[PDB]
Amino acid sequence: ANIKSAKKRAIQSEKARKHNASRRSMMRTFIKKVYAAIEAGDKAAAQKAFNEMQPIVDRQAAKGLIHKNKAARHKANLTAQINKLA
Amino acid sequence: ARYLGPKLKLSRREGTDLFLKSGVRAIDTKCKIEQAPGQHGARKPRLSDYGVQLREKQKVRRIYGVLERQFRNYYKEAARLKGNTGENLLALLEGRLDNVVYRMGFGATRAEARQLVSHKAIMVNGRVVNIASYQVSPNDVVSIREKAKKQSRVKAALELAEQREKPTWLEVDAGKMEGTFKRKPERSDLSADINEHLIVELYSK
Amino acid sequence: VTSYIGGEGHNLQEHSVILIRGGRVKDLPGVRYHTVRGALDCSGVKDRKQARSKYGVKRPKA
Amino acid sequence: SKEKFERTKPHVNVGTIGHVDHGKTTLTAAITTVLAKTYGGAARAFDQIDNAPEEKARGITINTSHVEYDTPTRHYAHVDCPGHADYVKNMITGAAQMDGAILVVAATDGPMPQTREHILLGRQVGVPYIIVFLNKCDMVDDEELLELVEMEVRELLSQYDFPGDDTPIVRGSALKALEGDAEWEAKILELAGFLDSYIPEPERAIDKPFLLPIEDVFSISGRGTVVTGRVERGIIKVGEEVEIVGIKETQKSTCTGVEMFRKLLDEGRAGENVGVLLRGIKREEIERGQVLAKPGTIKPHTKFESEVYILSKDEGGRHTPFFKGYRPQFYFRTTDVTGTIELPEGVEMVMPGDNIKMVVTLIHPIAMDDGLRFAIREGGRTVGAGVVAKVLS
RNA sequence: AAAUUGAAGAGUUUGAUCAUGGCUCAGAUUGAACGCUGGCGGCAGGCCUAACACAUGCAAGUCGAACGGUAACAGGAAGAAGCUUGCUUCUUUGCUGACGAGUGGCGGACGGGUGAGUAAUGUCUGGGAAACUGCCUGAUGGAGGGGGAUAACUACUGGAAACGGUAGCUAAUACCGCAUAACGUCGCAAGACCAAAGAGGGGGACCUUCGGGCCUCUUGCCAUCGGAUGUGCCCAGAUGGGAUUAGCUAGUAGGUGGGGUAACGGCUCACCUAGGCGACGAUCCCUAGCUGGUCUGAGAGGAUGACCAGCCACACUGGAACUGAGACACGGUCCAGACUCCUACGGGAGGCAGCAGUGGGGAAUAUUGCACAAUGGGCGCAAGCCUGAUGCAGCCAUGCCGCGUGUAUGAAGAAGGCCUUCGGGUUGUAAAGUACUUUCAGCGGGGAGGAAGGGAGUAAAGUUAAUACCUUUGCUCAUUGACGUUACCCGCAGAAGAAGCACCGGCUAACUCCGUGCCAGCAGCCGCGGUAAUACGGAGGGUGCAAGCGUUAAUCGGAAUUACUGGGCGUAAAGCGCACGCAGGCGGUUUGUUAAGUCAGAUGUGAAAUCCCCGGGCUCAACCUGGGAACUGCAUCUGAUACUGGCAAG
RNA sequence: GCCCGGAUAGCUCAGUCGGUAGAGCAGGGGAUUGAAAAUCCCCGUGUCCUUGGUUCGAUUCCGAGUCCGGGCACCA
């Protein structure tokens, strides 16, 4: 083979590609609030930031935005960072 | 496939009757038995260990009338079979349809019996077999088709079978045009006119 | 390669496109081939009746 | 995937004759140009009178009746061939292939040497069915001098026993019919009026066993090897089993295509040029010395007995006797072959203007039977005409 | 249903002989070709060369039972008009059948093809621990509400075309947030945090815009935990050559911290330490998909992976990324490269290593087959749709086997050929003739099975709404074959249509004549042939094989001719010129103790196919297939300790 | 289909491109031998392109064709 009689499953794929990008980068840049509050030294501001994050940190893997069992390990890693602070 | 050419040619070359072409010449004019073929036929015969092997293999294949591919096949089958290969091959040769038809006097020669088989004549177990290489089973009955009961040569052949001993693994009835293959073909009744070891010794070279 | 050509009658020329099989013939130095008669530009040998499969000459005719 | 030519009415293969400069290619454009307007219904269009590079490239004239068109009685294809002596082979075969010919002369020149050569072919190898066209008439100021220019042609006709005035000799100016002059577009289609009725009509041997003596061969990309030429006899349909005899080993194929003028063909017909695609055939193996045919109807031979007449110098034959041991070129339909000849007991020569029995020995075999015509040639002239009286082995 | 039949010799060195030793060779096999010959049938087989390039066709879609729509087609319905006049035209109407196109879901990543790369972290064999999923399935719970977008379409509009552009409208099982959450998720715990879908069938009652609502039924959805086919990771062993193939590495080795991952690790970033790897083979270069297994041979051993099948890689080339359960992907996307092609010159298109087909290469290869019949596969709620998947005819002596080409009979053998001692001898019962039959092929007629399921109708039972709907099964009769005028059967002449090819010096079975006269050539080796050649060419006769025949190559045997099986070395080719001595190999004898080696034991495993053992079936065979055995080993663990090994003592 | 070149003794080379074609190298016969080599003595080859033509005369000039090498050319 070389060809198929339709091409449309590629265009359904691009429609999906652009609709994933448009909120996968949203959920990934909120993390700057947790890292800036980690950089500010303060455990309480670090936690408030991560508390804004939990809504998006579970939801991104429940939903298709990164899919699979990626929420558990991210939620665990982010607690494991901010518990280094006091 | 069958031997189509001059049949007493073979008998003269192998120095034996082969029980084929069983007719006679008038007043024995140029009856040409007990002499070798051709213009150089007056020569006294000369041997070798390879000549004896080739001539014993020719002998058995001229007895039962079988091709070389057929005999090479039967010898592989014989060697697959348990016991000794020599007797295993001879059992194959004694059970095949055309040969059992000659044995039961339906064909006065091997070629009469193979022609009978070609012409869809024999049913065995009541089911028709038109081919030379069907192995007749123990305790089965061979039966001439009604459209084959008319061959004047077969009705004559069963008279040419009288005062000719028949293998003790079968009986036949001229009056029925039916013969019982009463029991299993028996190596303790019939053999070829050769030594079974020499004819397979040459295959190792 | 040097290649032996069997039986008399030679139709071949210094650009005739031909086939050759093995022909072992240490009698002639280096020769390990034989030129196939009645193939490509090679025709069969003259005045033959004992060969048919050999010499490219075919079965004799009326 | 391609479009289909549909076999309604008969269809016949014709061709121009005469000398160089006379109009032999101008006429074949110009006739096809006015026919597509007048018979076909069209308005004068530039792509009618000029043609594309791609058609010129394959319908090279000298192997193809490169123009195919229709008229009210038959379809016609028409061939353009050299008016010079540098190449005559495809003219002298095209004579045995055509049901008649279009004799072209330019009023400015009169007849020239190849106009005197090509007229003999309809007696010698082909058919005496010739229709005539006088080109560049518009240049001559006087009709009564045009008539004296034309009186050369009535003499030439009468030289080879064509009726000098009961032959139809149309007046025209083919370069003016081509471009779109109102008078000369109106003085070309007169020729198709005579062509539809002078033959009087073509007739096809389509009841008979199939015989295609191959003229020429092509290599179609993606589909393989096509052999083409006038079908002399019989009929074809797509998927018939076919036999090739001649200069090669006898072989069997399947005709797996059948076309004419690069269009699909419901049926290959006798008396017309047809192309055939063939199963298990390579452009490497096949030769023009082949004949495609109905299986087991004709077989190759190199040797034959025949009757042959030696021309007289009247017809442009010999004046010297024709000796034994000669090496003439023979002509059979689409194909030429050379053979060495022999004369009867104690005959060293046969005189010009006499018939003899001859035995030939060709330098390669072709498929042959009795009743098959030939001519012999020794170069500068045809020197005899004859018929195969029986084959030899 | 267990089990073997398997092991060779021959020609050739000299005057002669023994021993040594090469060479030639009989046999088997190949996806083999060549040249001659050729009738019939089964089943099997057809690039094994250029991963060299392909014209043209045809090959993954599908669902109206997710949604908006109504182009096409028919219908109904209604309107309007006419003697087309109780039948008919024109129109309208998503109203219904229905469906072009659009939106949307699931699957296209499967099958099929190719074997280029790759001596491989891939593969094979056997195990290890930190993993995961289409979809099926167990179990438990759930389904709140709202918004937003936009194609089809509408209008407007550019370009030769590809390609479209501008602005407007709006639906969902589509899109998105919120709501709301477990045995869920994270957090040591407090606590915090996360989801989602409907659709469709149908009825008594009940609302009602008569649309719809409510109900029930069925089917689908979502969340979460389990199971399961499937898949990933890791680890040991095993995996061609070159050592005239001796160094390789920090881009590593080891660690620590972070990052990243489904999970795991220099995966990856950074630091710190300096290590890691190699001559029991790092490194480097050469070759090469593997394996089950196929062939050959007593087997060992060798060759070997092909036809089929398990696994792997690849799809004109090079880079990257993505959609998603899953894919730098064959059928897809961006970009680049090369070639080729179209073009209105502005611009664009494409990759048979699917299937059939073609050119080219080469020693050498089917028909742009046929088909819904049956099987698998994808979507399909089902009817249905898809499929070059699948099945099956064609072409060809390419493979294997079976069958026939007449047979029975038949001479003063008569012609003829051949040889001759000229008597005869022989070809040869061969021919003619006589007798019989037609198998096959032919012509004509008849004609099984591959067909199960599936359609509709209908009955009873169950599900349930008292009720439909829905469903399980039964019954009625409706219906389905490409191959195909089938397999097979029956009639009917009639021997009618069916033998060629190589061989005859020896090895090697087959002899005589004639010509040739070291010539033609002749063999594989030894050799032959220089005018009384079974060695040449022809002739006849003989041998052998046969619808095949010979010949060439290739592989394996013979070979023990690299000798474990199974060798020599004073001198047949051959023992180091000598010593010393590390590496490595090897080590007396006795006591105890140990158990790595060895040995016994058990359990798990190496599928199919292949072989074996024993059947079955297609008439037999080829062919197909069942059951039973087979699988030398590996993993893990239990027992023994004579012996070799270890450790300790003497 | 078209265009170009090649047809002197086995080989080579010459020869008024019309007027018995010459020489060399090699070869054949004889002698010698069972044969060959070698030697010694005698002697031949020309498809002087096939085939048709031009002429007073073809080896040599002109057409035709066959084979062989090379060029040009097409894809129903």
Curated annotation (Swiss-Prot), chain A:
Presence of the UniProt keyword rRNA-binding in the record: yes
Keywords: Ribonucleoprotein, Ribosomal protein, RNA-binding, rRNA-binding
Pfam families according to UniProt: Ribosomal_S20p (PF01649)
Domain of life: Bacteria
Keyword hit for RNA-binding: yes
GO BP: cytoplasmic translation; ribosomal small subunit assembly
Gene3D superfamilies attached to this UniProt entry: Ribosomal protein S20
One of the record's GO cellular component terms: small ribosomal subunit
GO function term, MF aspect, one: structural constituent of ribosome
SUPFAM superfamilies linked to this entry: Ribosomal protein S20
Region (Disordered), start-end ranges: 1-25
Alphabetized InterPro entries for the sequence: Ribosomal_bS20, Ribosomal_bS20_sf
Family that this chain belongs to: Belongs to the bacterial ribosomal protein bS20 family.
Function per UniProt: Binds directly to 16S ribosomal RNA.
UniProt subunit comment: Part of the 30S ribosomal subunit.
NCBIfam families, per database record: S20 (TIGR00029)
Protein name: Small ribosomal subunit protein bS20
Source organism of this protein record: Escherichia coli (strain K12)
From Swiss-Prot, chain B:
One GO cellular component term noted in the UniProt record for this chain: cytosolic small ribosomal subunit
Domain (S4 RNA-binding): residue spans on this chain: 95-155
Keyword Ribonucleoprotein annotated: yes
Protein task: One of two assembly initiator proteins for the 30S subunit, it binds directly to 16S rRNA where it nucleates assembly of the body of the 30S subunit.
GO process terms (BP): cytoplasmic translation; DNA-templated transcription termination; maintenance of translational fidelity; negative regulation of translational initiation; response to antibiotic; ribosomal small subunit assembly; ribosomal small subunit biogenesis; transcription antitermination
InterPro entries for the chain: Ribosomal_uS4, Ribosomal_uS4_bac-type, Ribosomal_uS4_CS, Ribosomal_uS4_N, S4_RNA-bd, S4_RNA-bd_sf
Protein name per UniProt: Small ribosomal subunit protein uS4
Recorded name of the encoding gene: rpsD
HAMAP family to which the protein is assigned, alphabetical: Ribosomal_uS4_B (MF_01306_B)
UniProt source species: Escherichia coli (strain K12)
Cysteine disulfide partners in this protein: none
From Swiss-Prot, chain C:
tRNA-binding recorded as keyword: yes
Modified residues (3-methylthioaspartic acid): 27
Outcome after substituting residue 26 to Q: Confers low-level resistance to streptomycin and a 15% decrease in the translational elongation rate
Single biological process term from Gene Ontology: response to antibiotic
Domain of life: Bacteria
Gene Ontology cellular component annotations, sorted alphabetically: cytoplasm; cytosol; cytosolic small ribosomal subunit; ribosome
One function term, GO molecular function aspect: structural constituent of ribosome
Keyword Ribosomal protein among UniProt keywords: yes
Range of residues in the leader sequence: none
Keywords: Acetylation, Antibiotic resistance, Methylation, Ribonucleoprotein, Ribosomal protein, RNA-binding, rRNA-binding, tRNA-binding
Modified residues annotated as N6-acetyllysine in this record: 46
Assembly, per entry: Part of the 30S ribosomal subunit. Contacts proteins S8 and S17. Interacts with ArfA. May interact with IF1 in the 30S initiation complex.
UniProt family annotation: Belongs to the universal ribosomal protein uS12 family.
Miscellaneous section: At least 19 substitutions or deletions in 11 codons can promote streptomycin resistance, dependence or pseudodependence; all but one of the streptomycin resistant mutations (K42R) are associated with hyperaccurate translation and thus reduced translational efficiency. The streptomycin sensitive allele is dominant to resistant alleles.
Protein name in the entry: Small ribosomal subunit protein uS12
Organism lineage: Bacteria, Pseudomonadati, Pseudomonadota, Gammaproteobacteria, Enterobacterales
Residues of the full protein shown: 63 to 124 of 124
From Swiss-Prot, chain D:
Region (G3): 80-83
Sites of N6-methyllysine modification: 56
Principal place of residence: cytoplasm
Effect of residue 136 to R/Q/E/I: Reduces affinity for GDP
EC number(s) given by UniProt: 3.6.5.3
Reactions this protein catalyses: GTP + H2O = GDP + phosphate + H(+)
Region (G2): 59-63
Function per UniProt: GTP hydrolase that promotes the GTP-dependent binding of aminoacyl-tRNA to the A-site of ribosomes during protein biosynthesis. May play an important regulatory role in cell growth and in the bacterial response to nutrient deprivation.
Official protein name in the record: Elongation factor Tu 2
Organism: Escherichia coli (strain K12)
